[PDB]
Predict the structure of Bll6730 protein.
Amino acid sequence: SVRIVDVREITKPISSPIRNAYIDFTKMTTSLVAVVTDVVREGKRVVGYGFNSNGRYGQGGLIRERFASRILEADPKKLLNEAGDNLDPDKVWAAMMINEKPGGHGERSVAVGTIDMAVWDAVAKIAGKPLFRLLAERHGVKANPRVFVYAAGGYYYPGKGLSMLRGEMRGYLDRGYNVVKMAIGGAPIEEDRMRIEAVLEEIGKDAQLAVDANGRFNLETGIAYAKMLRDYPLFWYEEVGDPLDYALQAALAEFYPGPMATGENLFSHQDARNLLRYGGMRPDRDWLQFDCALSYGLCEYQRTLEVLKTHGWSPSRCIPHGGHQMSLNIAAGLGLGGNESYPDLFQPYGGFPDGVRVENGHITMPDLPGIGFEGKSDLYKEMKALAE
Amino acid sequence: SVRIVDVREITKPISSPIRNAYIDFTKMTTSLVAVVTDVVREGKRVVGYGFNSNGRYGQGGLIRERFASRILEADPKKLLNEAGDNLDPDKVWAAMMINEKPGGHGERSVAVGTIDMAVWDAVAKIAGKPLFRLLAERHGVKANPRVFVYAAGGYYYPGKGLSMLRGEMRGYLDRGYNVVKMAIGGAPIEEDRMRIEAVLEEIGKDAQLAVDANGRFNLETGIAYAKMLRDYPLFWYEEVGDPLDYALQAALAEFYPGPMATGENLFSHQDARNLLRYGGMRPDRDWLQFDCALSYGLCEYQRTLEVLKTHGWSPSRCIPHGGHQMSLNIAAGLGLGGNESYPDLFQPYGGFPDGVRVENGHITMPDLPGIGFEGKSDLYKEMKALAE
Ligand SMILES: [Mg+2]
Ligand SMILES: [Mg+2]
């Protein structure tokens, strides 16, 4: 007997006055979800957990009012795999997606992606395997526990000056990171130049710098920043214009030969397909940042990887946004290019298991069952408080 | 003094076992919203009302947790027009859109669009004008109260046969409609052919038939249906494939010269822009069905009309999905091609003021202040029950 006995949710705050070119995180929240089963492993009830990434807010209402109910109301026998000894993630996905009209991929994509995370967590636990190894198995590939991670921060903050910006970055380098990201477009172009040079000077030859415009720029502004930016050895220029203005992105290739990245705000394989079709991105050097937690989960992310193949892209071009363990498992299991990380933000959500250190921009996935949340005490404390 | 004193919401059920190619309306709901102002004329305070269209579900949670609060917390003086004698819809729009990241246009687009509807309703009432006339004024154009409307139905229903389908359609013709729409793709292609011929025979020369696939078809199926459909004198072929698969839509032009329609499931001007850029639709005969109530409202719809102009399209190509009075006002005020109508569904939401009859596919907008909800007793009853 294998069945989902309950789906609990609790909205947690991850707010602060940090600000980027488009938004400030003054009221930012996230949904912590628990998928409770009636299965037991390692002498404890198996409970899958999940939470959504920063930026799109918690989805308690949708989870309760539309998706959780469908799962709990579904015939338990129709959510199992071939052998009937575990849950089939895709069947659970399909079950919660009934009566949902096409298009409109936002908000509900976060609710579903967060539940999906907890479902895969439970499935892996029931199978007694680390999620990344279960994924490698299902895809017939060899997993690689060594995953590249970069530190994201450099936000605009009330009273935060250049010296403080430099300190923040040095703080990331002190922790083993060799690639850092900062926000831009939240100040006059010449002020951002100063912020960039300050950071560039601080990290010297020990790390590379990536900048994020958060989709705030129109074509002309995007080009203006491109001309200023291309004179520096940046790791990448992220989300220059509106995430859906593919023509704008395509036009940037003419002014910015260096690597660019985007995708965190595209939440479906259909939207990702359109990015690959009309975005004009360079598959040899650009980065795709789709976030499964905000995009209907891993079940959907697999369809997105299928889209990349149809368009001749390599999964190694993917570096998910979000800084969460779900992405780490996908990266390690399916060969993504790496994962984002927020060493000083949104804690305890995200991060790594207690003990794993970042060495030369890389961490090594320990063999913990499921996603590995249990290994991060301050996070797991929050989770077992929700359901155990 | 002009200020929004409260924003109330109540989720109403508009469910039934009707089914289309993609979804069934078993759990369908809608949010009824009231924007209460401190403006009282003759011991009667002005209250704006709004509700979202069928298909995307109610958004009580989002409205309460994210948007209403921003409006109520905003400085009342910063939401007024130049003269400070009325609310500025765009300022209210901007106020509720703060701290919202780009992309992900779904769900929140419905919440905002529903509040927006109530805001414009209140603004027009405060100005003492029918919304459509206020719109014509703001755009410097002449309003036209005669609006084209078509009856939408023909859903798959348990135990509903051809005879019953025929009766449904005759029922619409009896009420003055000369264009009817039915769902397709919810049965084998040859069964749908039978349903189509049945309806075609029933309406004879008194009306034209439109078919809706609800975005269920893949390219090959879309083409197969196109070959079958093009042999009949259909009014239009709606949403053939996924609303975001623009390439699929473009490819259909080769097999279906007759008019096609889509757009109900695109909820932003950015998404509409992409449809015009990559959809390959014929601006001389196709129809755009964007629904302001599901797309961030009229404030956003105006930006969408701007997008149509930038791409050489005429607003007369627009026939909003949803069957609601907000669209009727926009159609009459800005010259859209007409509006959808559900004579037998989702009542009392949608419809026309008590007394206005559909004659030869057209209704004539009476000069009621605001949207004109007060003129439809069964609907207004529900509204004043929410707030008065
Ligand atoms: Mg970013
Ligand atoms: Mg339709």
